[PDB]
Amino acid sequence: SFKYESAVQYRPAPDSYLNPCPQAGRIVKETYTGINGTKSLNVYLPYGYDPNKKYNIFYLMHGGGENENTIFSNDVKLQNILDHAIMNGELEPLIVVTPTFNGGNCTAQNFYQEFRQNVIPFVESKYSTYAESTTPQGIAASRMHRGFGGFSMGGLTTWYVMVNCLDYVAYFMPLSGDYWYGNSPQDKANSIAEAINRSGLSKREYFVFAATGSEDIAYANMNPQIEAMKALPHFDYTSDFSKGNFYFLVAPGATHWWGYVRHYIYDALPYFFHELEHHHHHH
Amino acid sequence: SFKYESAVQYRPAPDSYLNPCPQAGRIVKETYTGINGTKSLNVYLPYGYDPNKKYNIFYLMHGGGENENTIFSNDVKLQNILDHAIMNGELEPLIVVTPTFNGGNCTAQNFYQEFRQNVIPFVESKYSTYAESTTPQGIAASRMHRGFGGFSMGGLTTWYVMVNCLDYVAYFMPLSGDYWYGNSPQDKANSIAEAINRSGLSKREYFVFAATGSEDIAYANMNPQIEAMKALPHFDYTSDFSKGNFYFLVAPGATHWWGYVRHYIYDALPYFFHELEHHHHHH
């Protein structure tokens, strides 16, 4: 079983996890129409996916110049990691969706709107999540079973998703991404605080697991933001999400490259979705 | 609303709480037969008690030379404190039961057996608790909504209840009571640890809020026991039961007397029954 650590450390997946696992989850290519026109995404279903069961769902965004296919391409191979981790019992089965911020009027920053209105209702009406319906009320009532993350520009997307979508999403994984508000780290922090206040949520209802590499240029802006967030009452700093809600993993020597960032996901994603989960688990 | 503090301090109820509250809960005198013959207890029902609702239940034991009527007599007046705290919103409504360790073969130490077999089934078949039935399975499945405490010899009773009844009871309030096992504080601690291990429970499924006065002779044996318990992995020391599960409140200058001990209860009882509660509360 999984056990929460209070300060989890960078730990890459074994080399063999980058290769195909014979217990492969199905990746389905989907096309949908929304406020930024006709676009595509991929949905990863866990091996043994049973549509009579309910699954947590994690949405994960690519970086600049990439697209909805990148994360599951040979350039990244995240599905192989997911497959092997799920078969070995390190990660509880979940749906992982890779959308895009390209197309139409869409930008990494404004994607949250298409996410709220088109992406969630499209995905979660077809696949089996904890959403009982895809009205605003049904999405909001299943928020504990929904997560959002992304790398670089997709990291930035994640931040704008948290500030605009706390009603719909409880778990956030910004990977090497800055957030732009005011002109100081404190102003960034305070914008996030004000979003949390408007939401009415308690400290046990939102969770942030950020990460980057110590040789990734994103560290320069992320670290002061994280420090300013630590000062806020809204966040209790620890990776033990049974006790707190905010952690920053820094991989020593890691650069701004999917080859490393895929391992952040391997490290952080097993920490998601246990709070108020419907299983009886000791973590 | 109530908010958890990480190190709650001794704070007596206002003087006016010792007087009758016009929103008085009903105290019902009950007689039952069990393994120690025919005996009595009192059941305190909260003001507005609705038998269509479910209530948490706290069992509370008297000291040496006292009886099932003592805690709700003029010598103690706990019901007035309960009444006023419940009317002012400081304590969520609950059933409080005062049994006795007198009669038959019963002793403060061996009461746990009569408690398991006769007291719980008698009380919880008549009054409205979270127990869906009073078989061993129905009691065990409602354990998160059951608590046990007591003063002096009743404190000792509480300890023997924890070591024998973790399957039935999640919250424990030993007040000025020692536990006897081995001849060192570590041996006491290790006996409690071994009981927790046999139960299969996690750290989020049992809670201990101990207390005494700094001028109460019980402090002499309680404090080394508590220290030895702190060292165990089984217990995370803090009164914030959303994060940990073990606290020791020491009232400075307080003596071995109900006049003080009733205030420990006022302080500690609002901390009980919130973990995995069926209400939507921010604490």
Residue numbers in the entry:
A (entry chain A), B (entry chain A): 803 to 1085
What does the paper say about this structure?
The RoboDiff forms the core of the services offered on the ESRF beamline MASSIF-1 and, thus far, has been used to mount, characterize and collect diffraction data from over 20 000 samples since September 2014. In all three cases diffraction images were indexed and integrated using XDS and reduced using AIMLESS.
ARP/wARP was then run for automatic model building. Both models were completed manually using Coot interspersed with refinement with REFMAC5.
